[PDB]
Amino acid sequence: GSMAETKAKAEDLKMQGNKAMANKDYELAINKYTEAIKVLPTNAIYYANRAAAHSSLKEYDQAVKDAESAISIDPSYFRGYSRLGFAKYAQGKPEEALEAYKKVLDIEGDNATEAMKRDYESAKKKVEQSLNL
Amino acid sequence: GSMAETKAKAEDLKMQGNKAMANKDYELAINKYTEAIKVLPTNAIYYANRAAAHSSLKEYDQAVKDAESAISIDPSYFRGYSRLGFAKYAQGKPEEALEAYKKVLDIEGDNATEAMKRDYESAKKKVEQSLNL
Amino acid sequence: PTVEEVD
Amino acid sequence: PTVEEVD
Ligand SMILES: [Zn+2]
Ligand SMILES: [Zn+2]
Ligand SMILES: [Zn+2]
Ligand SMILES: [Zn+2]
Ligand SMILES: [Zn+2]
Ligand SMILES: [Zn+2]
Ligand SMILES: [Zn+2]
Ligand SMILES: [Zn+2]
Ligand SMILES: [Zn+2]
C-alpha cells in the first residue's frame, strides 16, 4: 500500500463515476464518487463531482454539503463554487448563488468561459428581482 | 467617449471577428481582431484570437507572434499559451509546444479540463516519437 | 441554468 | 491538437 497505489485506485473510481454520469446513472455515480472519497478523502474533485450527481437528482441539500466540502478542501478549485452556486440557485437562494458564481469569476478572471459569465448574470438578475418585489 | 464605450467598440469588433471565425472567413477575422487591437491594445484576448485566425490559415509564424504578444500582455491568460502550443506543434516544434501546453496545466492546476490534458499528452507523444527515431 | 460536466 | 474556439 503506497500513496501512488491509493491515488490510482481512487482515480479509477472517479473514472467509473464519470462514466456513470455520462450514462445518466446518477445513482451509480454517487456510489463511485463516495467510494473514491473513502479511498482518498483529501481530493476536492471527488466531492465536486458527487455534488453534480446529487444536483442531477435534485438533491440540492446533499449537493450543497459536497460543494462546501470541495471548497473547504481546495478553495482554488473553482468548480466547487460552480456546484455550490447551481444548487443554491435551484433552492431559491439567489444571493448565495450569486456569491458562489462571482467567486468563480474572481478566480478565473479573463480566463472565464462564457458559461461562467452566464451563470453569474442569471444569479444577478434573480437577486435584482428579489428586491423589486 | 467613455472608457466603457471604447471597450464596447473593441468588443463589438471582437464579436465580428468571432462571427467571421464561425463562418471560416479567416481573413476577415484577422481584420476584425486587428481593428479591435487598434481600438484597445491592452487586451490579450484579441491577440490570442488573432493567433487562432492565423493558425486557421496555417500562418504559424504570425500566430506565434500574436500568441507571444498575448503572453507578454497577460501572463496568466492561459489561452495565450494554448495558442502558442498549437502553432509550435503545427510547426513541428513539439518540445516548445509541450512547454506551452504544460504552462496551461501549471496555471490551471486541478482546474485543468480534459481538453487541456489532451493537448499536453499530444505534444508529449510527439516529443517522445521524435527522440525514439 | 448551466449544468456543468464532471471533472 | 486543434485550433480551439476563439475567446
Ligand atoms: Zn506498500
Ligand atoms: Zn445503474
Ligand atoms: Zn460501488
Ligand atoms: Zn484558472
Ligand atoms: Zn488577465
Ligand atoms: Zn470576406
Ligand atoms: Zn474592417
Ligand atoms: Zn535506429
Ligand atoms: Zn491535432
- Mark which residues 8-47 of A lie under 8 Å from B by CB: 44-45
The string of DSSP codes covering B30-94 is HHHHHHHHHH-TT-HHHHHHHHHHHHHTT-HHHHHHHHHHHHHH-TT-THHHHHHHHHHHHTT-H
Query: Using beta carbons and an 8 Å cutoff, which residues of A are at the interface with C?
Result: 17-18, 21, 29, 45, 48-49, 52-53, 55-56, 79, 82-83, 86, 89-90, 115, 118-119, 122
The span from the CA of A11 to the CA of A45, in Å, is 10
Long-range contacts of B86-92 (CB under 8 A, 24+ apart): B86/B55, B86/B119, B86/D1, B86/D2, B86/D3, B86/D4, B87/B51, B87/B54, B87/B55, B87/B60, B87/B63, B88/B60, B88/B64, B89/B122, B89/B123, B89/B126, B89/D1, B90/B55, B90/B58, B90/B60, B90/D1, B91/B60, B91/B61, B91/B64
Provide the number of structural domains found in chain A.
1
Length of chain A: 133
Ligand 6 centre to CA of A83 (Å) is 42
Length of chain B: 133
> Do A100 and A82 contact (CB within 8 A), yes or no?
yes
- Report residue B25 CA to chain centroid gap: 17
Cβ-nearest to B45 among D1, D4, D7: D7
* Domain of residue B6, residue span: 1-133
Neighbours of A46 (CB within 10 A): 30
The span from the CA of A42 to the CA of A73, in Å, is 7
**CATH code at position A91:** 1.25.40.10
Q: What backbone phi and psi angles, to 5 degrees, belong to A87?
A: -75, -40
For residue A29, give Cα distances in angstroms to A52, A61, B60. Answer: 9, 17, 43
The string of DSSP codes covering chain A is --HHHHHHHHHHHHHHHHHHHHTT-HHHHHHHHHHHHHH-TT-HHHHHHHHHHHHHTT-HHHHHHHHHHHHHH-TT-THHHHHHHHHHHHTT-HHHHHHHHHHHHHHHGGG--HHHHHHHHHHHHHHHHHHH-
3-state secondary structure at position C1: coil
The residues, ordered by sequence, that sit 6+ positions from A18 with a Cβ below 8 Å of its Cβ are: A29, A49, C6
C-alpha cell at B130: 521524435
For residue A26, give Cα distances in angstroms to A31, A37, A122, B10. Answer: 9, 16, 26, 44
Neighbours of B51 (CB within 10 A): 32
Mind telling me how many Å the CA of D1 is from chain B's nearest CA?
Answer: 5
C-alpha cell at D4: 480551439
Length of chain D: 7
